[PDB]
Amino acid sequence: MSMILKEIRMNNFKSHVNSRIKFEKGIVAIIGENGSGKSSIFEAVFFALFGAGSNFNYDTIITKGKKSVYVELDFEVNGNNYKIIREYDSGRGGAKLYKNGKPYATTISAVNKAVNEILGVDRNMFLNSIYIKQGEIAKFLSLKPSEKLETVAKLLGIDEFEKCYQKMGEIVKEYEKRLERIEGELNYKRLKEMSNLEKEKEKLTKFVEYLDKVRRIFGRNGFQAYLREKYVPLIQKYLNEAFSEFDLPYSFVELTKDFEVRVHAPNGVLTIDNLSGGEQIAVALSLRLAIANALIGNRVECIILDEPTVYLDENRRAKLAEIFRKVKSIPQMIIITHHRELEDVADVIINVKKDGNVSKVKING
């Protein structure tokens, strides 16, 4: 799932009446006063791909004067090079999807079920790992521990296994009718040793057994639970490997079985409850980047973070800038702050000014 955003074009999109923006890789960094137009650039990226499902309010994203809304985005995903488009004219729109030049689906519903498999995560698994909205840097840790294992089970590759589970539950269906078949033929069936169909009856039965005992190697209480466990320690490594660069007064950070965060202070353990605004955001950031590293070459995507430096003080901001720079397991991190630090460390430095209600993008470097 190696994903990357090349450029994007948008029309009548909130404050972005009209503008195109080039996405160079590395330390991408949108910047601007309040309301300049920063998040919209990635509200739009997110529209293009997954278009607001329900017949929601389209008076939301359309520039408050206008009538239409056009967005088209360019992104290299898993090597290839795509382009999605979505629009809307008073009441009705549809979505076209080009693949190098050759379109793979051309309908609201077509391009839909197409964009899910060409990325591998639904609309919400998207906001849980690729696009981290303003306000939601800590969201993950705020989850119910089932909800946590649910979203991590997908980001790790464990979901696929649950497929293989319920697959092997259907596959044990065939080699059991087959077995019933033979049982029915062998109906009316010492110095009495076992016949050929009796020998097959047996083999076929010790087969089913083998088959199930493989189903269960795919089970929740099975290999899914080994993989997970063989995964935490590793995530932890990276968590603490980065959390430390913040110079907070704490031994290390335990990462539990069920992805709970436990902050070892000198006399006691503190939970993301006791931590402080700024402190939460640190562990939050450190964990996200942490799992990124953990699957270093298992899946190498890009990331959008919106105001990662929220609540963070003058010391911490810069520590984090130093962390981001140091970060390697992600090719495209575009970051959206209004803060000085992250600027002065940036490959790119995409500037957003807003001329009376209308926003203008002046790409830099």
Binding site: F207, L227, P233, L234, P266
Partner: protein
């Protein structure tokens, strides 16, 4: 007759206030004021500043002052001073000026060519500011003119603030071969001292001017932080005519307090210490109250209180890239099943292949139930 000596200095980081500590701020200003003094006491003919005089791009009034004063003297006692702006001093929204601008009649800010006369003999200087690696190319250009414009003169000096390949192995924006033949390379950005032959001439990193990261201490005792005094009298130079001036820094002390034998070795350092040191590293939990005892012989304790439970290396390198395929197989065996199969059953189930086959196969083929 014929006598020309310059002082090469770098990375002062004025204004840095480590661990939010009023003291460490003063430490950085002090170790600089000292240098300016010593340098003022050597009235060298020229001072080469390789960059990062300040810490931020909007350094505090006081740091700005402490500099403008020191540089005032420098040029009041007729000393010529050259400086390239480092990463911390290159303005990012032009229209705003680097802090170096506040020293403009005390110093020359290099991003070009220039020649200085000492003893009628003519020497050549070029340098330029910190360039990200991004714009690393337009740089080679710069060093080309530099090379060309410089062929003409016998003695040449290069000033740059970048990091270079063999010297910082990690993050660098230029490589060894990536630069032309000069006589001395006054470099900035590496904090540990560096001095060694290169392309018929001496290359140098004056290093920082205090301990800006805890890891520079061990590196500090071996080589000592300060500046380079360079005697460019004779027609050539070796490591021999490059004298190094030293300077004392706030002391750091690594304690790893595990047992009674240790808690003491730790005492054997703190008091065995010039001034109040910064202590860092580990300290098992049961010794913490008996350390706070020394909270007055100590400047600051950035050491980690380890839980009594854990008793192993956590900073120990254990490169794990869990090979899903490997693991799955290794696992399935532990249980009793043909891993080499259940794995193949796996790739197959996903690519939506024909499983019946794989099973129908194995079934007859290898399955001896």
């Amino acid at each position: 007759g014929s006598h020309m000596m310059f002082v090469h200095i770098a990375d002062n980081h004025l204004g840095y206030r480590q661990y939010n500590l009023d003291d460490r701020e003063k430490d950085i200003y002090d170790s600089f004021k000292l240098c300016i003094k010593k340098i003022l006491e050597i009235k060298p003919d020229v001072v080469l500043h390789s960059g990062d005089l300040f810490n931020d791009l909007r350094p505090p009034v006081k740091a700005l002052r402490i500099a403008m004063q020191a540089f005032k003297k420098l040029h009041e006692n007729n000393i010529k001073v050259y400086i390239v702006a480092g990463n911390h001093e290159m303005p990012r929204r032009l229209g705003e000026e680097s802090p170096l601008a506040l020293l403009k009649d005390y110093v020359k800010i290099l991003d070009g060519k220039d020649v200085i006369n000492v003893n009628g003999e003519e020497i050549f200087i070029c340098g330029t500011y910190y360039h990200k690696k991004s714009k690393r190319e337009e740089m080679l250009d710069k060093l080309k003119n530099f090379e060309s414009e410089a062929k003409n003169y016998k003695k040449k000096i290069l000033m740059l603030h970048q990091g270079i390949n063999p010297y910082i192995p990690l993050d660098y924006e230029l490589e060894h071969f990536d630069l032309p033949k000069f006589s001395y390379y006054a470099l900035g950005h590496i904090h540990k001292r560096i001095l060694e032959r290169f392309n018929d001439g001496i290359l140098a990193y004056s290093g920082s001017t205090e301990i800006i990261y805890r890891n520079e201490y061990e590196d500090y005792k071996k080589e000592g932080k300060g500046f380079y005094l360079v005697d460019f009298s004779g027609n050539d130079l070796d490591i021999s005519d490059i004298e190094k001036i030293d300077i004392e820094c706030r002391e750091f002390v690594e304690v790893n307090i595990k047992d009674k034998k240790s808690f003491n070795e730790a005492v054997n350092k703190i008091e065995r210490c010039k001034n109040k040191p910064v202590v860092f590293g580990k300290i098992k939990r049961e010794f913490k109250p008996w350390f706070d005892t020394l909270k007055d012989k100590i400047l600051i304790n950035k050491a980690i209180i380890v839980d009594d439970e854990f008793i192993d290396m956590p900073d120990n390198v254990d490169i794990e890239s869990l090979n899903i395929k490997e693991l799955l197989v290794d696992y399935a065996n532990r249980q009793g099943i043909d891993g080499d199969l259940v794995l193949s059953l796996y790739k197959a189930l996903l690519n939506n292949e024909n499983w019946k086959e794989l099973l129908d196969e194995y079934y007859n083929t290898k399955f001896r139930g």
